[PDB]
Design a protein around this motif. Structure first.
Motif, PDB file in Angstrom:
ATOM      1  N   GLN A   1       2.459 -15.869  -2.500  1.00  0.00           N
ATOM      2  CA  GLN A   1       1.080 -15.577  -2.162  1.00  0.00           C
ATOM      3  C   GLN A   1       0.742 -16.101  -0.776  1.00  0.00           C
ATOM      4  O   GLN A   1       1.263 -17.123  -0.327  1.00  0.00           O
ATOM      5  CB  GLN A   1       0.155 -16.180  -3.210  1.00  0.00           C
ATOM      6  CG  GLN A   1      -1.331 -15.892  -3.033  1.00  0.00           C
ATOM      7  CD  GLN A   1      -1.673 -14.401  -3.198  1.00  0.00           C
ATOM      8  OE1 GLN A   1      -1.178 -13.691  -4.047  1.00  0.00           O
ATOM      9  NE2 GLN A   1      -2.515 -13.941  -2.360  1.00  0.00           N
ATOM     10  N   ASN A   2      -0.083 -15.339  -0.070  1.00  0.00           N
ATOM     11  CA  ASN A   2      -0.612 -15.767   1.207  1.00  0.00           C
ATOM     12  C   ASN A   2      -2.130 -15.778   1.273  1.00  0.00           C
ATOM     13  O   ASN A   2      -2.674 -16.397   2.192  1.00  0.00           O
ATOM     14  CB  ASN A   2      -0.062 -14.882   2.329  1.00  0.00           C
ATOM     15  CG  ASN A   2       1.443 -14.868   2.355  1.00  0.00           C
ATOM     16  OD1 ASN A   2       2.063 -13.819   2.488  1.00  0.00           O
ATOM     17  ND2 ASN A   2       2.042 -16.040   2.220  1.00  0.00           N
ATOM     18  N   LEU A   3      -2.834 -15.127   0.345  1.00  0.00           N
ATOM     19  CA  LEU A   3      -4.291 -15.276   0.231  1.00  0.00           C
ATOM     20  C   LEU A   3      -4.558 -16.534  -0.587  1.00  0.00           C
ATOM     21  O   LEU A   3      -4.893 -16.508  -1.771  1.00  0.00           O
ATOM     22  CB  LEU A   3      -4.933 -14.027  -0.366  1.00  0.00           C
ATOM     23  CG  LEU A   3      -6.387 -13.604  -0.570  1.00  0.00           C
ATOM     24  CD1 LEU A   3      -6.441 -12.104  -0.566  1.00  0.00           C
ATOM     25  CD2 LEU A   3      -6.941 -14.027  -1.908  1.00  0.00           C
ATOM     26  N   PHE A   4      -4.329 -17.666   0.070  1.00  0.00           N
ATOM     27  CA  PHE A   4      -4.619 -18.945  -0.553  1.00  0.00           C
ATOM     28  C   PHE A   4      -6.119 -19.138  -0.707  1.00  0.00           C
ATOM     29  O   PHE A   4      -6.591 -19.606  -1.749  1.00  0.00           O
ATOM     30  CB  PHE A   4      -3.998 -20.063   0.275  1.00  0.00           C
ATOM     31  CG  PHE A   4      -4.229 -21.425  -0.284  1.00  0.00           C
ATOM     32  CD1 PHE A   4      -3.679 -21.798  -1.497  1.00  0.00           C
ATOM     33  CD2 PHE A   4      -5.011 -22.334   0.403  1.00  0.00           C
ATOM     34  CE1 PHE A   4      -3.903 -23.062  -2.007  1.00  0.00           C
ATOM     35  CE2 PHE A   4      -5.239 -23.596  -0.095  1.00  0.00           C
ATOM     36  CZ  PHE A   4      -4.692 -23.958  -1.303  1.00  0.00           C
ATOM     37  N   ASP A   5      -6.884 -18.759   0.307  1.00  0.00           N
ATOM     38  CA  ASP A   5      -8.332 -18.850   0.279  1.00  0.00           C
ATOM     39  C   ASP A   5      -8.900 -17.522  -0.198  1.00  0.00           C
ATOM     40  O   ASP A   5      -8.147 -16.636  -0.587  1.00  0.00           O
ATOM     41  CB  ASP A   5      -8.861 -19.261   1.658  1.00  0.00           C
ATOM     42  CG  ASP A   5      -8.472 -18.287   2.776  1.00  0.00           C
ATOM     43  OD1 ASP A   5      -7.742 -17.297   2.548  1.00  0.00           O
ATOM     44  OD2 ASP A   5      -8.910 -18.529   3.919  1.00  0.00           O
ATOM     45  N   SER A   6     -10.227 -17.370  -0.114  1.00  0.00           N
ATOM     46  CA  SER A   6     -10.964 -16.148  -0.480  1.00  0.00           C
ATOM     47  C   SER A   6     -10.700 -15.728  -1.928  1.00  0.00           C
ATOM     48  O   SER A   6     -10.331 -14.586  -2.211  1.00  0.00           O
ATOM     49  CB  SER A   6     -10.680 -14.993   0.488  1.00  0.00           C
ATOM     50  OG  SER A   6      -9.348 -14.540   0.385  1.00  0.00           O
ATOM     51  N   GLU A   7     -10.873 -16.679  -2.850  1.00  0.00           N
ATOM     52  CA  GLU A   7     -10.942 -16.380  -4.280  1.00  0.00           C
ATOM     53  C   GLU A   7     -12.054 -17.121  -5.010  1.00  0.00           C
ATOM     54  O   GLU A   7     -12.363 -16.746  -6.144  1.00  0.00           O
ATOM     55  CB  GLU A   7      -9.602 -16.686  -4.967  1.00  0.00           C
ATOM     56  CG  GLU A   7      -9.313 -18.160  -5.108  1.00  0.00           C
ATOM     57  CD  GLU A   7      -8.295 -18.465  -6.182  1.00  0.00           C
ATOM     58  OE1 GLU A   7      -7.807 -17.519  -6.830  1.00  0.00           O
ATOM     59  OE2 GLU A   7      -7.990 -19.656  -6.391  1.00  0.00           O
TER      60      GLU A   7
ATOM     61  N   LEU B   1     -10.606 -20.909  -9.961  1.00  0.00           N
ATOM     62  CA  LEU B   1      -9.441 -21.746  -9.694  1.00  0.00           C
ATOM     63  C   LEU B   1      -8.283 -21.382 -10.613  1.00  0.00           C
ATOM     64  O   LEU B   1      -7.122 -21.411 -10.201  1.00  0.00           O
ATOM     65  CB  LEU B   1      -9.814 -23.222  -9.831  1.00  0.00           C
ATOM     66  CG  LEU B   1      -8.666 -24.214  -9.657  1.00  0.00           C
ATOM     67  CD1 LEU B   1      -8.347 -24.404  -8.184  1.00  0.00           C
ATOM     68  CD2 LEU B   1      -8.982 -25.532 -10.326  1.00  0.00           C
ATOM     69  N   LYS B   2      -8.590 -20.925 -11.811  1.00  0.00           N
ATOM     70  CA  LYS B   2      -7.666 -20.389 -12.782  1.00  0.00           C
ATOM     71  C   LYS B   2      -7.425 -18.930 -12.526  1.00  0.00           C
ATOM     72  O   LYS B   2      -7.385 -18.131 -13.449  1.00  0.00           O
ATOM     73  CB  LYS B   2      -8.201 -20.573 -14.209  1.00  0.00           C
ATOM     74  CG  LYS B   2      -8.316 -22.002 -14.749  1.00  0.00           C
ATOM     75  CD  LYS B   2      -7.026 -22.773 -14.764  1.00  0.00           C
ATOM     76  CE  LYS B   2      -7.285 -24.155 -15.330  1.00  0.00           C
ATOM     77  NZ  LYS B   2      -6.045 -24.867 -15.661  1.00  0.00           N
ATOM     78  N   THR B   3      -7.512 -18.492 -11.297  1.00  0.00           N
ATOM     79  CA  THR B   3      -6.986 -17.186 -10.989  1.00  0.00           C
ATOM     80  C   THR B   3      -5.650 -17.296 -10.306  1.00  0.00           C
ATOM     81  O   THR B   3      -5.003 -16.267 -10.076  1.00  0.00           O
ATOM     82  CB  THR B   3      -7.946 -16.418 -10.098  1.00  0.00           C
ATOM     83  OG1 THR B   3      -8.367 -17.271  -9.034  1.00  0.00           O
ATOM     84  CG2 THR B   3      -9.152 -15.977 -10.885  1.00  0.00           C
ATOM     85  N   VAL B   4      -5.239 -18.520  -9.974  1.00  0.00           N
ATOM     86  CA  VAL B   4      -3.999 -18.694  -9.242  1.00  0.00           C
ATOM     87  C   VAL B   4      -2.820 -18.306 -10.117  1.00  0.00           C
ATOM     88  O   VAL B   4      -1.913 -17.640  -9.645  1.00  0.00           O
ATOM     89  CB  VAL B   4      -3.873 -20.123  -8.670  1.00  0.00           C
ATOM     90  CG1 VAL B   4      -3.926 -21.190  -9.747  1.00  0.00           C
ATOM     91  CG2 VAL B   4      -2.618 -20.262  -7.818  1.00  0.00           C
TER      92      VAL B   4
ATOM     93  N   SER C   1       1.896 -15.683 -11.791  1.00  0.00           N
ATOM     94  CA  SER C   1       2.644 -14.840 -12.705  1.00  0.00           C
ATOM     95  C   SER C   1       3.377 -13.767 -11.937  1.00  0.00           C
ATOM     96  O   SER C   1       4.558 -13.519 -12.199  1.00  0.00           O
ATOM     97  CB  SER C   1       1.709 -14.207 -13.725  1.00  0.00           C
ATOM     98  OG  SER C   1       1.207 -12.980 -13.223  1.00  0.00           O
ATOM     99  N   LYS C   2       2.715 -13.187 -10.929  1.00  0.00           N
ATOM    100  CA  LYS C   2       3.450 -12.281 -10.040  1.00  0.00           C
ATOM    101  C   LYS C   2       4.545 -12.996  -9.250  1.00  0.00           C
ATOM    102  O   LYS C   2       5.468 -12.344  -8.758  1.00  0.00           O
ATOM    103  CB  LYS C   2       2.526 -11.569  -9.052  1.00  0.00           C
ATOM    104  CG  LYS C   2       1.104 -11.412  -9.506  1.00  0.00           C
ATOM    105  CD  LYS C   2       0.969 -10.424 -10.653  1.00  0.00           C
ATOM    106  CE  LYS C   2      -0.487 -10.193 -11.000  1.00  0.00           C
ATOM    107  NZ  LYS C   2      -0.647  -9.073 -11.961  1.00  0.00           N
ATOM    108  N   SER C   3       4.456 -14.311  -9.096  1.00  0.00           N
ATOM    109  CA  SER C   3       5.559 -15.040  -8.473  1.00  0.00           C
ATOM    110  C   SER C   3       6.609 -15.474  -9.499  1.00  0.00           C
ATOM    111  O   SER C   3       7.777 -15.093  -9.402  1.00  0.00           O
ATOM    112  CB  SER C   3       5.023 -16.256  -7.715  1.00  0.00           C
ATOM    113  OG  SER C   3       4.688 -17.293  -8.612  1.00  0.00           O
TER     114      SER C   3
END
Lengths: 113, 113, 100
Positions: free
Chosen positions: B64-70, B91-94, B99-101
DNA sequence: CAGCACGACGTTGTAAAACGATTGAGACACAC
DNA sequence: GTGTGTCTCAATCGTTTTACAACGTCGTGCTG
């Protein structure tokens, strides 16, 4: 598979401290000192040499499963057991066990090989 | 392998396909030690450079690279009572991303291993 | 090609039994000054030996301890004969190749 | 003519010599 | 200059075939 495992642990841990927590496992390999496979015999002789080099205080009760290999039919067990008797002889200091090294050496002055 | 890694990370619609051949050419390799050892490492070891391909693909693994903007906000002042402002579920969207990682890393790792 | 189908008492029958000390193994070694009759002409003085213990036998070349099939092939490429050789006659066996 | 002896000859069930696929252990390297 | 990491030599544990020794089968040579 029984050959492989005892062949692996002969160099696996590089620390006999596993047997500081598992003397019953050490008691397992003591039982296999008289297996029919001449290959697994030496492995026991190598492991038991290493166990004395660090955990030195087991000179007496180990000693029995060592000279029991010198009077064996295979040459590999004899050519290995002898060299371990070398190391044991210096580190030990009881003269009463030193003489038992000698008597078992001179008895093998002549051999089939 | 740089281009291969870029195309791996960027175009997943045929991300598998390159993998489908990257191991195949692995069959035609130097079959001896003196030729397999190649470009040295920094810590003082010599490896086969073709090996760095495998790790390199999962080195990308679409991190992941969109660390921010969630989340609506950064940290609060007292999180030990209530996540004031920020949303814990945001915060529990990471783990959705993770999961994609995670659930794809082993998925790639098991096509090969 | 003799002393092949031996057995325990055979591979013991050809040792020395005496009062000195029990002997375990025996060995014979010959030295040939060939020129080119034997194929490895790189060696001008070929040497062969066969040691025999009570439970081992090994053919050899110049201290090279090769197996049996190779020395068989070596002697075969030379002008030798594997089986009962005509150029050798044992004791009283001279009336051999006149009544077979 | 026919019956006995006997001695070479061809199968047949074996035990043993030998065979190949595994291990561990000396002698060439380097390359900082 | 010292540890490196790779290449080459020895035992041993199932197979395999292969030499070997026992056993009917014939065929020639006699003697009554």
């Amino acid at each position: 598979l029984r050959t492989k495992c005892l062949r692996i642990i002969n160099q696996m841990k590089t620390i006999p401290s596993i047997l500081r927590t598992h003397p019953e496992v050490l008691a397992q390999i003591i039982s296999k000192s008289n297996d029919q496979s001449a290959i697994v015999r030496d492995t026991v002789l190598d492991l038991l040499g290493t166990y004395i080099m660090a955990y030195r205080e087991t000179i007496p009760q180990i000693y029995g499963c060592i000279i029991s290999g010198i009077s064996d039919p295979s040459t590999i067990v004899r050519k290995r057991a002898i060299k371990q008797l070398c190391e044991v002889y210096e580190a030990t200091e009881d003269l009463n066990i030193r003489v038992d090294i000698a008597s078992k050496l001179l008895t093998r002055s002549n051999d089939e090989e | 392998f740089q281009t291969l890694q870029y195309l791996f990370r960027l175009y997943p619609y045929q991300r598998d396909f390159i993998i489908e051949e990257s191991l195949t050419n692995f069959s035609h390799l130097p079959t001896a030690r003196s030729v397999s050892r190649t470009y040295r490492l920094s810590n003082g070891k010599s490896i086969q450079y073709y090996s760095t391909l495998f790790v390199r693909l999962i080195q990308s693994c679409s991190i992941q690279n969109l660390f921010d903007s969630e989340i609506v906000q950064s940290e609060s002042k007292s999180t030990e009572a209530l996540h004031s402002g920020n949303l814990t579920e945001h915060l529990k969207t990471v783990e959705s991303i993770l999961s994609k990682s995670r659930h794809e890393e082993y998925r790639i790792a098991n096509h090969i291993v | 090609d003799a002393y092949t189908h031996l057995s325990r008492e055979e591979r013991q029958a050809l040792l020395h039994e005496g009062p000195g000390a029990t002997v375990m193994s025996a060995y014979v070694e010959v030295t040939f000054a060939n020129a080119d009759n034997r194929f490895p002409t790189g060696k001008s003085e070929v040497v062969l030996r066969r040691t025999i213990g009570l439970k081992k036998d090994e053919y050899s070349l110049d201290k090279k301890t090769v197996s049996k099939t190779e020395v068989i092939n070596l002697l075969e490429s030379a002008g030798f004969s594997r089986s009962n050789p005509y150029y050798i006659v044992p004791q009283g066996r001279v009336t051999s190749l006149t009544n077979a």
